[PDB]
Design a protein around this ligand. Structure first.
Ligand SMILES: [Zn+2]
Lengths: 67, 171, 52, 148, 191, 121
RNA sequence: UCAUCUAGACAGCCGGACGGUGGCCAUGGAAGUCGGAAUCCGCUAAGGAGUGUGUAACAACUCACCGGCCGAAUGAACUAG
């Protein structure tokens, strides 16, 4: 037989990851993560939906499965 | 509070024996103009023989960040007073602007050394223009090629006091 | 007399230890701090007193 | 067949070594004194070769001994056991001669090096009228040919 | 300091198969099988190429990345224990009274009994954990061998047999009597 | 300081490669310093013996790779404890001396590089 | 605050750890290791006129130094939450 593990992948944060702004002034639009500041916050930009380029805490966005 | 950076330029009051004093300039992180001018006179009383009654302030101008959407690494040199003595520290912060970097610096010193705003002196803050001059591991960790990491254990705060299913912490 | 090798093997567990000066704990011979909480993990250690 | 080496002040334990070889202590001492004659006043390494009947004594060359001999020394009784600090003239030729005498025995690295080592051996001797021993050895290339 | 990614590797030989659902590890090899619950340690496993498995922790503290190398060593010990096995040799040490060790059966449970340790009338019985086989070795005087797959079970049984022979109310640097483990290794050592 | 000593090593090695066409790679195991010293003295006239950290040497050869390209072939052989003998004498005479001297209970010549050609010998 | 560091660092194994020279005084002896001073060369990749064990003195063993494996940060002293 062959070795079996449960992979348990989830939604890595990196550049090009599409996120949905959960709360704030945008509050429901899509953005793309441009760069990673630190463990808790990232620089995003949402230029089609009208989200200005900004640094934002990761607790205010939800990561989508889109990359 | 939420900090802003100002340049404050001042001088001594002109006398007949010496008109045109030398117009000293300093960069202050402060909440507003009043606190900025107070900190300016505080550091000039630490440096030169002048005080507010004997001098005047010729200009105060807010300096906002040149590229507020570039991610920088800043090295910050700081004096602080502990409970037994005075120490110098160098901390470096990866952040998007100078005022936010010194805000996280003030939070970091208050959290890790119980140092207050009255005890912290900001010697200087400067952007590190080149990588591999970064000397701290906690910021050198985020400079690697294709940095990616997951966020385990998602907790979603609820609006209702009762939930009708067992929640999941998948992200 | 036991045997020389067997005395060495028994003394490995009984005699080649260290003693904490504060709480008398029997410690590994290459240890630097005591493993006990009551002495505060002190580094005051001495060798266990041999015969002869 | 058997060689025994001892450092002996001249003019003279020895018995303990002699008993193994079954050789009279007095006979050995006389032979040694005979050899060390050159400078019994100073300690020196003596080689005794045993033929299973008798032991032949020779003085093996030693840098310290040769250097001490080179420094001119008034004979000392040693009853005084004084410090007897040794002060010496430059004796550049003597040291070069000593290096040549060593003849790179025991593989000294170079003829010049053998001399430099000989100079170092004069930790005890002043080895110069006005200089630290071998201080100028690096500075001056003179006498490199002489050592060879 | 919140190390955001630390990661260890375990090598899987040709004979074994490792099955990891949530944090329950099952290792199956030639000598048998072993299992381990690891739901207390909070890591993540990832099979790379059916002979390599990476174990990782993200955003971990100092204690947490210590536990990562600990759990790597535990699962690697399990793999090498089901491939090569584990063998502990212990020696009997006495001055005057010879230690007489046998195997008895109260209600079919394979007890190891120890008689005449320093001449006492008390009989010391240590139970035997399952999966551990005990052989009184020939051709070396006064030597007992405990073998098995689980290093935990074998070394714990050896330690129980060592601790059951402790001397009371005497200078133990002079009264060195006991049963002490002299060798730890594999059943198929130098394979 | 450390780098300065290191820089000198790089330079001398380059000079040695240029100076002698014949190169002998010698592996030393359990050879005493005294044993080594005697060998050096015997071969002082016709041979140069160089000992160095391998990591240091490999970088040097790569650094000097543009000139003397054939020396690149020596790099696979450099792995393991090694010493470099640079000699005017073409081959056997040097080899015979190295193996014979100081065998006690042991120098061995692992490979020979001469004129861009490698010989197992 | 000092140092080391992909020209290979710190742990762990393995190998060498040498000659002048038993350096000079002093001792019944003390040869790196009872002490007093000096503490320098050669060969070096590297090895102290010695870090300990060590013998009457030796001999012997180990060190701090350099090397193969390892490939990346680590050691000492100090400060304060
Ligand atoms: Zn204690």
């Amino acid at each position: 037989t062959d070795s079996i593990v449960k992979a348990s992948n989830w939604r890595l944060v990196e550049v090009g990851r599409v996120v949905l702004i959960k709360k704030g002034q945008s509050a429901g639009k899509l953005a793309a993560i441009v760069e990673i500041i630190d463990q808790k916050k990232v620089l995003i930009d949402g230029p089609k939906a009208g989200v200005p380029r900004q640094a934002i805490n990761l607790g205010q966005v939800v990561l989508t499965p889109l990359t | 509070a939420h900090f802003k950076e100002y340049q404050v330029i001042g001088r001594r009051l002109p006398t007949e024996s010496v008109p045109e004093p030398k117009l000293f300039r300093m960069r202050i992180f402060a909440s507003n103009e009043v606190i900025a001018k107070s900190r300016y006179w505080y550091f000039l009383q630490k440096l030169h023989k002048v005080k507010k009654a004997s001098g005047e302030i010729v200009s105060i101008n807010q300096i906002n960040e040149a590229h507020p959407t570039k991610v920088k690494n800043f090295g910050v040199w700081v004096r602080y007073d502990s409970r037994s003595g005075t120490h110098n520290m160098y901390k470096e912060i990866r952040d998007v602007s100078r005022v936010a970097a010194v805000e996280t610096l003030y939070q970091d010193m208050a959290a890790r050394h119980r140092a207050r705003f009255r005890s912290i002196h900001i010697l200087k803050v400067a952007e590190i223009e080149k990588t591999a001059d970064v000397k701290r591991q906690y910021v050198k960790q985020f400079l690697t090629k294709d940095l990616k990491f997951p966020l385990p254990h998602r907790v979603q705060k609820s609006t209702k006091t009762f939930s009708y299913k067992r929640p999941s912490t998948f992200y | 007399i036991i045997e020389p090798s067997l005395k060495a093997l028994a003394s490995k567990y009984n005699c080649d230890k260290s003693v904490c000066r504060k709480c008398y704990a029997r410690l590994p011979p290459r240890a630097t701090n005591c493993r006990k909480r009551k002495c505060g993990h002190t580094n005051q250690l001495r060798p266990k007193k041999k015969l002869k | 067949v058997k060689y025994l080496y001892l450092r002996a002040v001249g003019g003279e334990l020895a018995p303990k070594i002699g008993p193994l070889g079954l050789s009279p202590k007095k006979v050995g001492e006389d032979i040694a004194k005979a050899t060390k004659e050159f400078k019994g006043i100073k300690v020196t390494v003596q080689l005794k070769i045993q033929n299973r009947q008798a032991a032949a004594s020779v003085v093996p060359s030693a840098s310290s001994l040769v250097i001490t001999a080179l420094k001119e020394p008034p004979r000392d009784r040693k009853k005084d056991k004084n410090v007897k600090h040794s002060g010496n003239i430059q004796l550049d030729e003597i040291i070069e001669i000593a290096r040549q005498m060593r003849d790179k025995s025991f593989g000294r690295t170079l003829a010049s090096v053998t001399k430099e080592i000989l100079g170092t051996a004069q930790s005890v001797g002043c080895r110069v009228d006005f200089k630290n021993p071998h201080d100028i050895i690096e500075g001056i290339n003179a006498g490199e040919i002489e050592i060879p | 300091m919140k190390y955001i990614q630390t990661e260890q590797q375990i090598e899987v030989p040709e004979g074994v198969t490792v099955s990891i659902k949530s944090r329950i590890v099952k290792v199956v090899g030639p000598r048998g099988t072993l299992t381990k619950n690891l739901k207390h340690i909070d890591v993540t496993f990832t099979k790379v190429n059916n002979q390599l498995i990476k174990v990782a922790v993200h955003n971990g503290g100092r204690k947490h990345v210590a536990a990562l190398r600990t759990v790597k060593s535990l699962v690697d010990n399990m793999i090498t224990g089901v491939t090569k096995g584990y063998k502990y040799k212990m020696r009997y040490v006495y001055a005057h009274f010879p230690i007489n060790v046998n195997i008895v059966e109260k209600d079919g449970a394979k007890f190891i009994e120890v008689r005449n340790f320093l001449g006492d009338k008390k009989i010391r019985n240590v139970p035997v954990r399952d999966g551990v086989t005990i052989e009184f070795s020939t051709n070396v005087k006064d030597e007992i061998v405990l073998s098995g797959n689980s290093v935990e079970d074998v070394s714990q049984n050896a330690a129980d047999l060592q601790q059951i022979c402790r001397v009371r109310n005497k200078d133990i640097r002079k009264f060195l009597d006991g049963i002490y483990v002299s060798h730890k290794g594999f059943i198929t050592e130098d394979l | 300081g450390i780098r300065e000593k290191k820089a000198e090593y790089f330079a001398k090695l380059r000079e040695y490669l240029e100076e002698y066409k014949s190169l002998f790679v010698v592996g030393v195991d359990n050879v005493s310093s005294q044993q080594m010293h005697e060998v050096r003295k015997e071969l002082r006239g016709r041979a140069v013996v160089l000992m160095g950290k391998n990591t240091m040497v490999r970088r040097a050869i790569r650094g000097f790779l543009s000139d003397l390209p054939d020396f690149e072939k020596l790099l696979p052989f450099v792995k393991g404890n090694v010493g470099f003998v640079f000699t005017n004498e073409p081959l056997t005479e040097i080899k015979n001396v190295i193996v014979s001297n100081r065998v006690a209970a042991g120098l061995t010549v692992v490979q020979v590089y001469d004129n861009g050609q490698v010989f197992p010998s």
